[PDB]
Amino acid sequence: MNFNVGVDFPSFIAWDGEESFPVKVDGFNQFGFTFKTIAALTAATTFNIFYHEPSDADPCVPGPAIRVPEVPFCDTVLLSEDGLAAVTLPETVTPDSFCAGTVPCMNGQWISIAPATGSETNAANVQITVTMKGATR
Amino acid sequence: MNFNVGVDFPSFIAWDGEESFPVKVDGFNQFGFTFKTIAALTAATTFNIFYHEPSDADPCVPGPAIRVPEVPFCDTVLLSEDGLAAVTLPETVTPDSFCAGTVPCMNGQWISIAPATGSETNAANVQITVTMKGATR
């Protein structure tokens, strides 16, 4: 009785392990991430978040990637040192264990994730996707 | 104000463009596909669907790759040569819209998609992922 949840909360690949894929989030008003492990990893892999803009050369292809300014919660005791927004999966996460995350405030039309410095060779195993849940049109 | 939609409708990479990926669905009770193109296409692509069962080794390794059969609706009235419910992505589709497929009848714990013969070359520009609906832990 599995309904067609393709429409009505679709999903797209964010990070396959080799390259990023900027994805539009305009038509949707909310969204979130999903992380998955394919093999045991050596360190707590880190990732940098970026947001793009509609490039004025063509208002369909995204522009360059800018680091997004995460706003800390009211009791975020430890906040980003200077890496305005980023994520870091804890070490010792095994396969068949999905992970969830999101940012509180967006500032563009395209979101992208990249393996942050020093965690590339371990990011070649984790897969990342994005789920959006808006219609807006 | 995006919610934590990582949990509550997650998602996982299905067909990346190079190699399929068995995804657990025992976990939940309603799931669906989201197809996407990355560039221009050629003669419409064809994808076969496969299901796995718990292998006698890891009681959690998707077993062999057996093909899910086809079931008709009230007026499905349109039947392939065999059963074996597959899908055909029609060409002339731009990387700005998505396709939403969903098999109504499931059997097993690991769904998988494979590029049918005469489509792999044209399927290399296809990105397919699956997202679930329930939690049912």
Partner: peptide, 28 residues
């Protein structure tokens, strides 16, 4: 700052080596 809920997937059964203290009375 992004959180990381897991509620992981698959479930490995335990097994158990339940004891029922062995049979003896000897002391020497």
């Amino acid at each position: 700052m992004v959180k990381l809920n897991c509620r992981p997937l698959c479930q490995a059964p335990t097994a158990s080596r339940l004891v029922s203290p062995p049979c003896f009375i000897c002391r020497g």
